[PDB]
Design a protein around this ligand. Structure first.
Ligand SMILES: *Cc1ccc(-n2ccnc2)cc1
Ligand SMILES: *Cc1ccc(-n2ccnc2)cc1
Ligand SMILES: [Ca+2]
Ligand SMILES: [Ca+2]
Ligand SMILES: [Ca+2]
Ligand SMILES: [Ca+2]
Ligand SMILES: [Cl-]
Ligand SMILES: [Cl-]
Lengths: 7, 228, 228, 7
């Protein structure tokens, strides 16, 4: 799974 | 449920819940703050987003574990429990979408606020799309696309290419293309075009803004490395 | 709430919730299974313990974060929110204690089951004691002590010194002595006496039992290293 | 804080 935005 | 608490107290308690990693409480506090009817500041928008992203992020991880177990199995218990988590996930997504529709988006005039909320709308339709299997999946997918697309149109006209909200929006829209819309070439093109125009704009930034922008820029690079 | 689900389905769903790290669901499923009125197997007791330990463990960690923030502060919000989490923690502790009292303990005849439940009773009174400040703290502390002590008396008579439940009981009773009862010398004496008699009994064990026992034995060693 | 039993 790819990275979505994460703080 | 939060109607009797002060707006400022709800905000203060949302920050305390983040420190305690009590994200369900944090989401309930920020929902109460939104329902006060006043527009949200930049910091308050971030609190709202962080709270629900963590809540739905745990539900999505649980849903993936159970859907995997269910797939290898094919009693009713695994399907039943996967359906329970799925329904709770959809309830949280509907709650967030309801806040955006009543009435955060229509009152958001500035580019930073309007793009932020439209990105959220795309994200939570994306999460609905990850679990959708019925006659409404295509409409759910197009609702995510339409929300992402309006946000992108505004961000391209109103924000610099290094703006962290613009970068995070492009990151998530590229994930939408790859995972949801079965358009991996569109995902790769968006991520590379976004990265390259951010590269070329970094010289305008201070050291702190440079750090903010390159951090999201690395997420785009990680995905391109995984996809190519 | 779980009255209409089969016992076996509740157990199966509790295991699925553990895999999904949904410990609140896991606790609710195992509470439903206990309320079926049948005694619990060894494996089922472990599921019950794991579920509530994770639920109350998150509440305790959140309570410590908020109590710390509260202490440095001394608005009502920090105290209010600490009180909210504290009340939710006490509710979960009361629920577990209620299950043990109605009617897990009175039906537990075997040493392994009775010691397991009495250890649980000591643990959840210990968690109540960590947050107690009123006129009932001494009685709460003595309720933990009395439960731990009965479990220890049974375990010393009925179990070998390497039995993992006996070792875990001694570990937690020593933590009770150190953190709750202000008796660090008692804590150190219990941990060292427990460790040494386990040492001397390891030669009787298989490789798998040896691994189980030495793992808890290392927790006793870690505490002795921290306390001396 | 010391260690209590943990699975
Ligand atoms: C989607 C998204 C939310 C928040 C940020 N952000 C703000 C400040 N730094 C990063 C980026 C993207
Ligand atoms: C308190 C406690 C619970 C469970 C165990 N255990 C069982 C099997 N291995 C470890 C020990 C202590
Ligand atoms: Ca007011
Ligand atoms: Ca406005
Ligand atoms: Ca039945
Ligand atoms: Ca019995
Ligand atoms: Cl279910
Ligand atoms: Cl509160």
């Amino acid at each position: 799974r790819p990275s979505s935005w994460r703080q | 449920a939060m109607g009797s608490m002060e707006r400022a107290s709800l905000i203060q308690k949302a920050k305390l819940a983040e420190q305690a990693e009590r994200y369900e409480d944090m989401a309930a506090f920020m929902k109460g703050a939104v329902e006060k009817g006043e527009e949200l500041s930049c910091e308050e928008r971030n609190l709202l987003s962080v709270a629900y992203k963590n809540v739905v992020g745990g539900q999505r991880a649980a849903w993936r574990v159970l859907s995997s177990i269910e797939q290898k199995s094919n009693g009713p218990e695994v399907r039943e429990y996967r359906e329970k988590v799925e329904t709770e996930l959809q309830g949280v997504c509907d709650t967030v979408l309801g806040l955006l529709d009543s009435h955060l988006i229509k009152e958001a005039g500035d580019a930073e606020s309007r793009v932020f909320y439209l990105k959220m709308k795309g994200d939570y339709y994306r999460y609905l799309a990850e679990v959708a299997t019925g006659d409404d999946k295509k409409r759910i997918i197009d609702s995510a696309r339409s929300a992402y697309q309006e946000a992108m149109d505004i961000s391209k006209k109103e924000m610099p290419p290094t703006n962290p909200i613009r970068l995070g929006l492009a990151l998530n829209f590229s994930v939408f293309h790859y995972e949801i819309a079965n358009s991996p070439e569109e995902a790769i093109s968006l991520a590379k075009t976004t990265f390259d125009e951010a590269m070329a704009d970094l010289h305008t930034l201070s050291e702190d803004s440079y750090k903010d922008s390159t951090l999201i820029m690395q997420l785009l690079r990680d995905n391109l490395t995984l996809w190519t």
